[PDB]
Design a protein around this ligand. Structure first.
Ligand SMILES: Nc1ncnc2c1ncn2[C@@H]1O[C@H](COP(=O)(O)OP(=O)(O)OP(=O)(O)O)[C@@H](O)[C@H]1O
Ligand SMILES: [Ca+2]
Lengths: 367, 55, 75
């Protein structure tokens, strides 16, 4: 049944060599005989997917974790249809994405509590999809801890997206013939910098391939594409259902996060901002509540005085209706009201046909 | 007194839990014959309820 | 304590674990439940904070000829 997947999806390869070190980010013994500023598409070769399968984490686990490798230049519809149809995941009544660098090995205890209490329980009640970095690092790791903790106190499905290059122990993943089972060395002893293992809390994984040995931001384009497609997708009974709402949750970060929100805001994707998250998150919260001064302090000094960040903020404020700020309220610990308030605000309509999704969530939650 | 009895009820049960099966007149033979991750899951479960209870 | 959170933790000032380590110790020795709650609430890595020397300090802080001191002396 999976024989269609390799044909439909392709794994990119660097192919062309661009300046020992290589601009393509894959310094090997020798780039292909066929092999300036290296480009994602100009200097890449697309080959059929060779890492699709279902990971079975060593030791404790559910023995069910879909792992797929795909090129960035891929339609979000195909992956969504595959996830909905092949892997059997139910149509999500809600999908919430988590973004932010989450600087430091660990996050603030209150923030973690908010995440596990608010986000996970809310998703569990409505069976929402939680999409984060598919890596046991930074924000994605914290979410996995939250999901794991909630699971222990019993499920919730939380898919993951991560660039293929940064993944660790990719050898067991690589299988052109397919790997229905697969053993992953998730307990990777060497914390070799960029290379990371895969958190085993997530139920599915998307390995964005761009012909690189590891880099950040490669999945942003695909990530936004998938969110927009889902935002413009109906749940159940084909189109007879209702639109699937989507919300983006940002926690601290850097200019990359600021770029992501701006792209998401341009994508008509509602966004929510957590107060006290940190750099790249507090600045926007203050603006909703000089701009160069905040960038100096709210954002890191490097490029803080740069007006590119200020210009993005102005564009961000230009569509401030779509986004909003979740005030911690001294640790409110509840945000279903905040999420509903955001979605209704983002709707900006009156036909009441686009509010069924918000109504259902309002019903699912006790609010 | 009611609370005290309820408490003593355990002491009774423990006493008979370990007693040899046979009766006193035949108890002699019994005397002669006499001569992890789940825990982590459990603890997490306890804490969650505590946290909910306090909140 | 309310003043400290209102003023010292209004958010206009950052903080560090080493900054709060001394204050935490004082609160524990002085029996300030509200403060210790507040300090821990401010993202303090307790595990990395506690030290056997500090632990000894706390026990040494027993009140005068307190019963605990008698037990410690006997120990
Ligand atoms: N993909 C992952 N990689 C590493 N650790 C993970 C991953 N997913 C979950 N974890 C959990 O994160 C923690 C990793 O740190 P570490 O293993 O040192 O901690 P631990 O729970 O005290 O166990 P250990 O005895 O293995 O040290 C463990 O709890 C591990 O179960
Ligand atoms: Ca809607």
């Amino acid at each position: 049944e999976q024989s269609w997947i390799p044909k439909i999806f392709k794994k990119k390869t660097c192919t062309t060599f661009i300046v020992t070190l290589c601009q393509c980010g894959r310094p090997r013994t020798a780039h292909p005989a066929v092999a300036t500023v290296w480009d994602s598409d100009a200097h890449t070769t697309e080959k059929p997917t060779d890492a699709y399968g279902e990971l079975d984490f060593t030791g404790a686990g559910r023995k069910h974790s879909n792992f797929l490798r795909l090129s960035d230049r891929t339609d979000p519809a195909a992956v969504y249809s595959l996830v909905t149809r092949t892997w059997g995941f139910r149509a999500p009544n809600l999908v919430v994405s988590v973004l932010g660098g989450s600087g430091g090995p660990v996050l603030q205890t209150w923030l973690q509590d908010l995440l596990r209490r608010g986000l996970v329980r809310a998703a569990q009640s409505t069976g929402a999809w939680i999409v984060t970095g598919g890596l046991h690092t930074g924000i994605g790791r914290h979410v996995g801890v939250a999901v794991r903790d909630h699971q222990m106190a019993s499920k919730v499905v939380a898919m993951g997206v991560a660039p293929w290059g940064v993944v660790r122990n990719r050898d067991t993943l690589i299988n052109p013939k397919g790997s229905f089972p697969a053993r992953y060395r998730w307990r990777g002893d060497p914390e070799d910098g960029v290379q990371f293992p895969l958190d085993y809390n997530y139920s599915a994984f998307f390995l964005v391939d761009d012909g690189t040995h590891g880099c950040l931001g490669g999945e942003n384009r695909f990530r936004l594409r998938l969110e927009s497609y889902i935002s413009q997708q109906k749940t159940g009974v084909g189109g007879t259902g209702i639109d699937i709402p989507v919300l983006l949750l940002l926690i601290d970060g850097d200019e990359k996060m600021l770029t992501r929100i701006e792209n998401a805001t341009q994508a008509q994707l509602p966004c929510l901002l957590v107060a006290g998250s940190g750099g790249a998150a507090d600045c926007l919260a203050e603006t909703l509540e000089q701009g160069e001064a905040r960038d100096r302090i709210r954002r890191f000094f490097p490029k803080g005085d740069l007006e590119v960040l200020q210009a993005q903020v102005e564009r961000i404020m230009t569509r401030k209706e779509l986004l909003t700020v979740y005030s911690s309220e001294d640790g409110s610990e509840e945000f279903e009201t905040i999420v509903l308030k955001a979605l209704v605000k983002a709707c900006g309509s009156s036909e009441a046909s686009a509010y069924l999704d918000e109504l259902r969530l309002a019903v699912a939650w006790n609010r | 007194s009611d609370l005290y009895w309820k408490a003593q009820r355990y002491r009774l049960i423990r006493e008979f839990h370990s007693r040899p099966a046979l009766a006193p007149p035949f108890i002699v033979i019994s005397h002669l014959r006499l001569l992890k991750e789940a825990e982590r899951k459990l603890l997490t479960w306890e804490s969650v309820h505590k946290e909910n209870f306090l909140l | 304590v309310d003043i400290a959170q209102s003023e010292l933790f209004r958010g206009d000032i950052q903080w560090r674990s080493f900054h709060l380590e001394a204050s935490l110790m004082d609160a524990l020795l002085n029996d300030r439940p509200e403060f210790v709650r507040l300090l821990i609430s401010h993202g303090l890595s307790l595990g990395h904070f506690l030290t056997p020397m500090r632990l000894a300090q706390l026990y040494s802080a027993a009140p005068s000829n307190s019963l605990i001191r008698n037990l410690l002396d006997q120990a």
